[PDB]
Design a binder for this molecule. Sequence first.
Ligand code: K5P
Ligand code: K5P
Ligand code: CA
Lengths: 170, 163
Amino acid sequence: SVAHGLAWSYYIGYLRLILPELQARIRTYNQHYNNLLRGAVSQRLYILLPLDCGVPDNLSMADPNIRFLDKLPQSNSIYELLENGQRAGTCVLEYATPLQTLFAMSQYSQAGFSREDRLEQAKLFCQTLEDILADAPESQNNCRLIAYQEPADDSSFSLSQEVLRHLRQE
Amino acid sequence: SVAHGLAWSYYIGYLRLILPELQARIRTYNQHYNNLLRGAVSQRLYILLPLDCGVPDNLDPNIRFLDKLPQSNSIYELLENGQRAGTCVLEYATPLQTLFAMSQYSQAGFSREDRLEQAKLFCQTLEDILADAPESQNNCRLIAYQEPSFSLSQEVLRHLRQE
Ligand SMILES: COc1ccc([C@@H]2[C@@H](C(=O)O)c3ccccc3C(=O)N2c2ccc(C(C)(C)C)cc2)cc1
Ligand SMILES: COc1ccc([C@@H]2[C@@H](C(=O)O)c3ccccc3C(=O)N2c2ccc(C(C)(C)C)cc2)cc1
Ligand SMILES: [Ca+2]
């Protein structure tokens, strides 16, 4: 049942506060700070929600097709996404950082929290957060959760492709 | 049921990480930075848990900021009878802000009664995690309270004297 508190704190202490000014920050960046000869940053906050709760310290180390470009002024980061070796999209991207509690609990023997318990709580965190965001006034076509289970076959999943599928739905 | 996730995250993402080096940080302060007469900073981390979930933006005239704890934690002096009666590392259990904000958000369907119950369960769950945790070695004290004038300094001093 840890997922409920994780989802509510993440929304009420972070997403609720950053989503209202996000569009204005992206528009300011695109007009005044972005380099001339490249794409504009897309408008939504893209949140990576790996169901395995594996949150890396560097997105480029997780996928070489996701490259840091800049900080979004006014901490959020802009990345370029590659496909077939070329630039395919630019967006504000980050992980659902409360998943780190679920990961750490699965590694702490006193929690009595298995990998199966972790997966169940990650799914509940995603479901609860989606329900909150659906009813939230701050979420106005400006946030997208990217929840994913990684197949056993490495070749059948690309993190950059997962973000690109959502970005192309804009 | 939000209290469980709040307690586990607060422990596993913060208390578990800061409690092992806390007493060394307090010893550094007491030996090299503390210039008060018999004002050694107490050894434990004191965590304010207002059961009403009211966390102010800056931590009572009898509680006065002294310094940042080197190596963000803050040291305060506690006054009693107008004089310094103790010094400690003091801070709020910041996850209570989720419970307060939920009670202020109609779509959460979370009443003041639900809030109080979750604040008490957060305190109990956190105390139990800390009791079984290898990082809490007589170094973290939870100060849970409710208002009846209330004196926050008197609440902290009771726990300081218990150390
Ligand atoms: C003061 O006590 C805390 C406790 C936890 C957090 C963050 C923070 C986040 O960055 O998302 C968060 C917010 C809401 C719910 C859960 C978490 C969470 O899981 N945190 C966290 C938890 C664990 C980690 C390590 C295991 C990598 C160290 C890193 C980050 C921050 C302050
Ligand atoms: C990235 O997403 C987050 C979400 C929440 C937090 C912190 C953070 C804390 O400072 O204790 C925390 C950790 C673990 C569980 C809960 C909370 C929590 O309740 N937070 C919080 C929640 C709400 C507030 C306002 C309502 C005053 C703005 C302020 C702080 C930080 C990052
Ligand atoms: Ca594999």
